Amino acid sequence: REGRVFAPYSVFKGAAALSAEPRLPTFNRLDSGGVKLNRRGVIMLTFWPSVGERKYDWEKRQLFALSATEVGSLISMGTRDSSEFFHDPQVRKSLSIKPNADGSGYFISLSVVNNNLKTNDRFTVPVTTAEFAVMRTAFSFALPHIMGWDRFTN
Amino acid sequence: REGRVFAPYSVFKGAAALSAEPRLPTFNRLDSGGVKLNRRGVIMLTFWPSVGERKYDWEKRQLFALSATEVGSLISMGTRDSSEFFHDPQVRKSLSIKPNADGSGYFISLSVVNNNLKTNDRFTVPVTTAEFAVMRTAFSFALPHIMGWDRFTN
Amino acid sequence: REGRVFAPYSVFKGAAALSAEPRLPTFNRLDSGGVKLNRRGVIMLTFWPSVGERKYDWEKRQLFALSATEVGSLISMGTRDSSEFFHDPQVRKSLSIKPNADGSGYFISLSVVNNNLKTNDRFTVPVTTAEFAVMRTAFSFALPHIMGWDRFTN
Amino acid sequence: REGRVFAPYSVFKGAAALSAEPRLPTFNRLDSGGVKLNRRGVIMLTFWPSVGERKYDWEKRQLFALSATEVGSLISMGTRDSSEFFHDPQVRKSLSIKPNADGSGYFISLSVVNNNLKTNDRFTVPVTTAEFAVMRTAFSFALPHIMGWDRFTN
């Protein structure tokens, strides 16, 4: 617990909020010496809905984890590019990132569907060019770290 | 005080000078273990006016702090892009960055207005493409640091 | 052996798999003080063939080392760019990276030829834009490290 | 002397060779605590002439130091961009970087003139796109370091 860090980048908007934070990979120590990557690193996204003016319901939050490759998708997006990721379970989630009309930003939307319970939720947060540039730059910085490549240093 | 660092990037021009330097975020240590970001990091800009040939008046300086998102705005600017940031108080400040005619650089201008005292100041510094490229590269380097994301490392 | 790190980025596809990992340079310590780069750093690529559905034959793997300059070639590639590297021995190897039809990714192909033994092998792995973006970002991160330039720090 | 590092990036060509290496800034420690940048950092270029097939004369080398701003110029260069830097003394030096005909690389040329002694030297090294990409990526990595901004970290 001593090694925990909390420093999300968060964007609060009218209908919902979104936060992003890296999760580092885990490594296994080898008997013969050295380490080897174990559990993958991700960039974790958290979405939660507004319930009023500048008020949000943290209890209804839903998460979506971006793999290294999914981060690669996001950082290579141009002004007018779109993408969608589908994660299989019961509950199915999908994350879409689509440009706004003006190319002055995007809509980032998390869909959460439980067909069995007929429950259906969607959390959408607009992000400006400036905000998405923070995401690209920060996620690009984090990528080598979530891949474990920061361990290759002189 | 032992941890202070002074290493501004500065540009000195005919009517004014400008300097830029990161300010790191502060963190709070958690009782249960780990840390959490407290006070935001910024890139601090300082402007001061010329009073003669290669002479400037440091006593009349005025500051403007760039948030992570405002840095995102600056680093994603193309050759012909413009931007303006407004900071509310009494005294109101605004920062504009506009391309020059030739697309060989920009004008970075700080406006400081105190309507009550009818005082009105403006400090403008031209910056070349090369100088703005230093800013983009350096501010991009600093961004993960002012966000606290440098704490996520293996 | 205590300093070994294993954290490849790997892409598994229908006919073959590919993995990439940096190899750091070696340095020599100088009698008068300080260090000087000795053996070059590279980004090592490993290719091996499929033998069935999600099954591959590690025993038939073949390697190809990218120099700093060859990494420079890869990271500066645009969507529609191609490249080929030839490495002299007996056995000759060549590595090609060519865009797919749609510009939605590339084919990375390792050729291994032994004219004397008339043996002839080729291992080809398709990589998406997102996967190649991971490679560009990660290899760019690693470049200063494999060059030894990470040693120039305050 | 214990802190010296030697790890140039070097390009050897038909008529001349060129090497590049960062030089870190110096800092002064403050009585009240903390440090402040003193002597500027640069990227140092070294050129020397060929005297035969894969043979060069190190004794006739000439140097040229790139300031942070001059590095900004280099890293922001597009395929078809040119630049020239002039350094005043006695001896005057100028450094030009011009694209080749095909946009497949550049010519980097150091001029050294001593009008008084009527001595006149020029050392020119062609650099491929891949080689210049190493320079851009490596110099961009080094820039925050030569500016002293690597000292702003959590």
- Enumerate the residues of chain C whose CB falls inside 8 A of the CB of residue D24: 152-154
Query: What stretch of H or E contains B144?
Result: helix B129-147
Which residues of chain B make contact with D71, given a CB cutoff of 8 A?
A: 134
Report the Cα–Cα distance between both ends of chain A, in Å, rounded: 28
Beta strands in A14-104 (DSSP E): 16-23, 27-29, 35-37, 42-52, 55-56, 62-66, 83-87, 91-99
A30 SS3 class:
coil
> What are residue C71's phi and psi, to 5 degrees?
-65, -40
**Cα B89 from Cα B60, distance rounded (Å):** 19
Partners of C64 in the β-ladder? C45
| Radius of gyration, CA atoms only, chain C | 17
User: Does residue A117 contact residue A130 with C-beta atoms inside 8 Å?
Assistant: no
- Find all residues with CB under 8 Å of B31, minimum gap 6, and list them: none
Size of interface A-C (CB pairs under 8 A): 87
Q: Which residues contact D20 (CB under 8 A, 6 or more apart)?
A: D8, D9, D10, D43, D44, D45, D46, D135, D138, D139
Q: Count of CB atoms within 10 A of residue D34's CB? A: 16
Query: In chain D, which residue's Cα lies nearest the Cα of B105?
Result: D73
Tokens standing for D112?
Answer: 């050294």
Buried-state track B100-111, b at ≥16 Cβ within 10 A, e below 16 = eeeeebbebbbb
Of A3, A22, A58, which is closest to residue B30 (Cα–Cα)? A3
Structural domains present in chain A: 1-154 (2.30.31.10)
Q: Crossing angle for the helix pair A129-147 and B68-75, nearest 10 degrees?
A: 90
- Residues 6 or more apart in contact with residue C18 via CB below 8 angstroms: C10, C11, C45, C46, C47, C108, C123, C125, C127
CA triplet B75, B137, A42: central angle to 5 degrees?
A: 75
Contact C143, C71 (CB under 8 A): yes
Q: Do C7 and A37 touch (CB under 8 A)?
A: yes
Please give the single-letter amino acid code of residue C5: V
User: From CA A76, how far away is CA C133, in angstroms rounded?
Assistant: 6
Contact C103, C79 (CB under 8 A): yes
Q: Which chains touch D (3 or more CB pairs under 8 A)?
A: B, C
Q: Which token pair is D135?
A: 């320079």
Give the closest-approach CA distance of C29 to chain A in angstroms.
14
Provide CB contacts within 8 A for A82, sequence distance 6+: A96, A97, A98, A99
Test A138 with B149 for CB contact under 8 angstroms: yes
Nearest-neighbour CA in chain B from A113: distance (Å): 32
Structure token pair of residue B144: 């993960």
Smallest CA-to-CA distance from A109 within A121, A91, A92, A101 is with A121
Would you state the structure tokens that stand for residue C30, as one six-digit string? 């100088």
Please return the burial class of C61, using the count of CB atoms within 10 Å of its CB with bins 0-12, 13-18 and 19+.
middle
Query: Three-state DSSP class for D147?
Result: helix
Cβ under 8 Å to A: C residues 24-43: 24-25, 27
Output DSSP code: residue D33: S
Q: H or E segment at D142? A: helix D129-147
For this entry, resolution in Å reads 1.8
D61 to chain C, minimum CA–CA distance in Å?
20
Nearest to C46 by CA among C140, C133, C147, C123: C123
Helix-helix angle B68-75:B129-147, to 10 degrees: 150
Only one residue has tokens 């005294």, namely B91
Q: Label residue D14 exposed, middle or buried (CB < 10 Å: 0-12, 13-18, 19+).
A: exposed
Q: What is the 3-state secondary structure (H, E, C) of D47-115?
A: EEEEEECCEECHHHCEEEEECHHHHHHHHCCCCCCCEEEEECCCEEEEEEEEECCCCCEEEEEEEEEEC
- Helix %, strand %, coil % of chain A (to 5): 20, 45, 30
Query: Coil, helix or strand for A64?
Result: strand
d(CA A88, CA A129) in angstroms, rounded, equals: 30
Residues B78/B103, Cβ–Cβ less than 8 Å: no
Query: Which candidate, C150, B44, B106, B129, places its Cα nearest to that of D69?
Result: B129
Cα(D27)–Cα(D40) distance, rounded to whole angstroms? 9
Q: Helix or strand or coil: residue C137?
A: helix
Instruction: Find residues 110-129 of chain A whose CB sits inside 8 Å of chain C.
Output: none
Tokens of D87: 């350094």
Residue to mutate among A37, A44, A141, A153, with most B CBs inside 10 A, is A141
Name the residue among A65, A63, A64, A81 with its Cα closest to residue A73.
Answer: A81
D68: nearest Cα among D120, D24, D108, D7 = D24
Nearest to A75 by CA among A12, A5, A24, A132: A132
What DSSP assignment string belongs to B44-88?
EEEEEEEEETTEE-GGG-EEEEEPHHHHHHHHT--TT--EEEEE-
φ and ψ of A110, to 5 deg:
-105, 120
Task: Tell me which method was used to determine the 3D structure.
Answer: X-ray
Q: Which of B95, B149, B150 to mutate to test the interface with A (most CBs of A within 10 A)?
A: B149
> CA A67, CA A93: separation in Å to the nearest integer?
14
Chain D partners of B5 at a C-beta cutoff of 8 Å? Answer: 34-36, 148, 151-152
- Taking CB atoms and an 8 Å cutoff, what residues of chain B touch A7? 25, 27, 36-37, 147-149, 151-152
Contact B123, D61 (CB under 8 A): no
Q: How many CB atoms lie under 10 A from the CB of residue A17?
A: 21
C3 CB near a chain A CB, below 8 Å?
A: yes
Residue with tokens 């993960």: B144
Question: Does residue D46 sit in helix, strand or coil?
Answer: strand
A151 C-beta neighbours (distance < 10 Å), count = 21
C-alpha to C-alpha distance for A145 and A135, rounded to whole angstroms: 15
Q: What does the CA dihedral B25, B26, B28, B34 come to, rounded to 10 degrees? A: 50
Please list, in sequence order, all residues whose beta carbon lies within 8 angstroms of the beta carbon of residue B102, skipping any fewer than 6 positions away. none
Q: How far is CA A33 from CA A149, B35, C4, C6, in A?
A: 18, 31, 7, 11
Q: Please count the helices (runs of H) and the strands (runs of E) in chain C.
A: 2, 12
First to last CA, chain C: 28
CA–CA distances in Å: residue A129 to residues A13, A17, B69, D78: 15, 17, 9, 23
Nearest to B95 by CA among B60, B122, B61: B122
Measured in whole angstroms, the distance separating CA D83 from the mean position of its chain's CA atoms is 13
| Alpha carbon distance C47, C110 (integer Å) | 7
Beta-carbon contacts of A56 under 8 Å, excluding residues fewer than 6 positions away, are A12, A16, A17, A48, A49, A50
Angle at the Cα of D44 (from C70 to C39), degrees rounded to 5? Answer: 40
Chain C CB contacts of D4 under 8 Å are: 30, 33-35
Judge residue D29's burial from the number of C-beta atoms within 10 Å of its C-beta, 0-12 exposed, 13-18 middle, 19 or more buried.
exposed
Paired tokens of A13: 């908007």
Angstrom distance (rounded) from CA D139 to CA D69: 12
Contact between residue B66 and residue B45 where contact means Cβ atoms under 8 Å apart: yes
Taking CB atoms within 8 Å and a gap of at least 24, the contacts of B56-63 are B56/B12, B56/B16, B56/B17, B60/B121, B62/B93, B62/B110, B62/B112, B62/B121, B62/B123
Q: How far from chain centre, in Å, is Cα A86?
A: 13
Tell how strand B5-6 and strand D35-37 pair up: parallel
**Cα angle vertex C132, ends C127, C135, to 5°?**
125
- C41: DSSP letter: P
Residues of A in contact with B151 (CB under 8 A): 5, 7
Are the C-beta atoms of residues C71 and D9 closer than 8 Å to each other?
no
| Interstrand relation of B105-114 and C62-66 (parallel, antiparallel or unpaired) | unpaired
**Pairwise CA distance, residues C65 & C43, whole Å:** 6
